[PDB]
């Protein structure tokens, strides 16, 4: 089973303001469970998942104290990067972080993640080996040189292999009835006529969880770039939507639906009634 | 649980 814990951090500088906005978003199996925001009346790690209510005040206070330190780490790092790129003191700047791990089979650790970003583009990232760094530019090479002498990678590896794995095991046990929940998609084909004697057959897929789905059109065998596709969109009730369409002459064509919620892949055609 | 970063950039 593919299981993963992620922490999506953001630090946005404000014009003239001494303190920037720090947001830390936690994810378990691509779905949100925890969130911290500096803009709030009382900045604390708030539960976003219903199964997360099981934790006592000891867990919430410890995570909030971790976030307060991170809030200042991002504040200094953001100011140090202004010195590297030799940019103006007043402006809008963004520092992003992606950290966590993938379990694999079965509850053992498969891949470690630790990436950083500046102005939307890549900056510095910890490699697959979890010992070396990849610098996107010369400013990131200074950060790399700083982290190589201090041995930062050694302690980041200790989290991803230790604490990150240990805590994800607990979240899978506490939240199991709603986390391992699978929703099968609702599939149907629509008819849309066009000029020049052509028609667009749109293969729909509505109400499915998780977001991972595969929609392909077939002319008996395999239709690649000629097929129109849209990004997987959320409905709003914790479920997803997606469709795939193809331009065909004025016709019986096959659509293939691949989802983990359904036992056998769905094969469907158009009517008419 | 979240992670606390080491040395700054």
């Amino acid at each position: 089973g593919p299981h993963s814990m992620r922490y999506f951090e953001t630090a946005v500088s404000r014009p003239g303001l001494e303190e920037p906005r720090y947001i830390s978003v936690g994810y378990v199996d691509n779905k949100e469970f925890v969130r911290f925001d500096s803009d709030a009346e009382n900045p604390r790690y708030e539960p976003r998942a219903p199964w997360m209510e099981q934790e006592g005040p000891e867990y919430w206070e410890r995570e909030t104290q971790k976030a307060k330190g991170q809030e200042q780490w991002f504040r200094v790092s953001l100011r140090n990067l202004l010195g590297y790129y030799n940019q103006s003191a007043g402006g809008s700047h963004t520092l992003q972080q992606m950290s966590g791990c993938d379990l694999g089979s079965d509850w053992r650790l498969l891949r470690g993640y630790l990436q950083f970003a500046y102005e939307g583009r890549d900056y510095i990232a910890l490699n697959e080996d979890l010992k070396t760094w990849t610098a996107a530019d010369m400013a990131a090479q200074i950060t790399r040189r700083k982290w190589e002498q201090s041995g930062a990678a050694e302690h980041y590896k200790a989290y991803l292999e230790g604490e990150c794995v240990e805590w994800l095991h607990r979240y899978l046990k506490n939240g199991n009835a709603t986390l391992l929940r699978t929703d099968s998609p609702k599939a149907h084909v629509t008819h849309h006529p066009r000029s020049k004697g052509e028609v667009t057959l749109r293969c729909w897929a509505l109400g499915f969880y998780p977001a991972d789905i595969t929609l392909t059109w077939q002319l008996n065998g395999e239709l690649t770039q000629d097929m129109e596709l849209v990004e997987t969109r959320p409905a709003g009730d914790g479920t997803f939507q997606k469709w795939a369409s193809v331009v065909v002459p004025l016709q019986n064509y096959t659509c293939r639906v691949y989802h983990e919620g359904l036992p056998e892949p769905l094969t469907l055609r158009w009517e008419p009634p | 649980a979240s992670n606390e970063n080491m040395e700054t950039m």
Partner: T-cell receptor
Amino acid sequence: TVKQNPRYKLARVGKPVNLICSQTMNHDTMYWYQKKPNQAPKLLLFYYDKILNREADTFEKFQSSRPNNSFCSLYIGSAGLEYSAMYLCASSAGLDAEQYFGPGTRLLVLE
Amino acid sequence: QQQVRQSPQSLTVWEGETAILNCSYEDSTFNYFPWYQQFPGEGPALLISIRSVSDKKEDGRFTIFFNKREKKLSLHITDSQPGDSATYFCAASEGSGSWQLIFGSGTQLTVMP
């Protein structure tokens, strides 16, 4: 208020040096400054609780250790003639608050 | 530059007189301006500080006259005592980073009794 012992430190070239600084004020931030004779005290590095920050032009020359929030240390390895200066240690309750300086440790490196 | 530059290098004045210690800064974004005093064999202690909002800060004898339109500071010591004989430093810190105080070379004051 901000302790710094010894007041004078002596070391040979190539040998490592570790200058210790302590505070009883329970401050989150502790700084390290370099004071050259008849020159402005320049900031080397600082420690906010657990987080360490080093200046882009300072790093590779200076290292830092923190056993607990009440203490702070500046590490030099290896020592050279260019390291011979007065080393001041500052302490602040917050990252954006007033700084309280120690007496300073005068370092002299000889061949 | 930043820089921070201070004038003069060393000032000598008789007891009871008024001593003027000048300072100049380059960065206009500087808001906080603290003044430190250190005695021989003793570290710098916070004497008196001034912000960009105000242009005058009084504390008995020690006074700072801040000028934003000329980017300069001045420390006035009325009725100079021999106990004031110390090195006077001036620092400056901007908004985004208050931790980084850009200090001056200093002025070595000598009060003749």
